[PDB]
């Protein structure tokens, strides 16, 4: 996260760390949607142009973390993956369309003060909140700069959703209905963005109707970090909800 700040303890208890077994390294962010299911970006696991093709046995999921590098004894929980599911129509050849994936835990994790799931949006929640000008929140342990450092603790930043036309005019990549963009305008005099290591993490919003936190987006792509005139692109969770339900119902939950 570029231009964010240290998160408060227990502030994003659904925040998950995707962790490479060997070498030991941070791969991406992710989110806890139930006691057995993790949500992330497909490109975190599969990206052939870079020879990336991770498997169950390659990864570890760390939940309830605050510190980036420390092993948080008696706080964090480490879990093993039972199965990975990538959207059957994820488009890694062109524009990362449908950049979404589900991971089923080997065993349910137990909730605590630091570990708790986020809600998936409903049609009406999406309709009400996903509006230009509305702010959302992004979290992660990614870089602090495009070419710098690295945070010691989880970072946080609030960003406004941007009008579709402005999003489209900022890039040469083909935008779809399965994506949205966010960030401040060069004009706005406020910055911030996700960056390397933050991919696959959550973009969330707090409902003013029922006080619950909802995951509206997944950190997908962006040209550099915090560039003027550029924005961050996120996977449109709601548009893909049916595929989510489908997988969770046909395979466990």
């Amino acid at each position: 996260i570029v231009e964010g700040s240290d998160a408060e303890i227990g502030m994003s208890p659904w925040q998950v760390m995707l962790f490479r077994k060997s070498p030991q390294e941070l791969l991406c962010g992710a989110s806890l949607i139930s006691d057995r299911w993790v949500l992330t970006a497909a490109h975190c696991l599969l990206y052939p142009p870079w020879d990336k093709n991770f498997t169950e046995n390659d990864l570890l999921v760390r939940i309830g973390k605050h510190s980036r590098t420390r092993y948080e004894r008696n706080i964090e929980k480490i879990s093993m993956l039972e199965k990975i599911y990538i959207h059957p129509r994820y488009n890694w050849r062109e524009n990362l369309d449908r950049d979404i994936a589900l991971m089923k835990l080997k065993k349910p994790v137990a909730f605590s003060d630091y570990i708790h799931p986020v809600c998936l949006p409903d049609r009406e929640t999406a309709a009400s909140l996903l509006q230009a000008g509305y702010k959302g929140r992004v979290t992660g342990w990614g870089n602090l700069k495009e070419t710098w450092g690295q945070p010691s603790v989880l970072q946080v930043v609030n960003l406004p959703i941007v009008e579709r036309p402005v999003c489209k005019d900022s890039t040469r990549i083909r935008i779809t209905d399965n994506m949205f963009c966010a960030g401040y305008k060069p004009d706005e005099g406020k910055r911030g963005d996700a960056c390397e290591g933050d991919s696959g993490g959550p973009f969330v919003m707090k409902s003013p109707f029922n006080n619950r936190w909802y995951q509206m987006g997944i950190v997908s792509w962006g040209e550099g970090c915090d560039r003027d005139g550029k924005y961050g692109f996120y996977t449109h969770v709601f548009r893909l909800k049916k595929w989510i339900q489908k997988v969770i119902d046909q395979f466990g939950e």
Binding site: E25, L60, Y71, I78
Partner: peptide, 10 residues
């Protein structure tokens, strides 16, 4: 830079 995680996990 990562601190060593328990072996039960590897």
């Amino acid at each position: 830079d990562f601190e060593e995680i328990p072996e039960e996990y590897l």
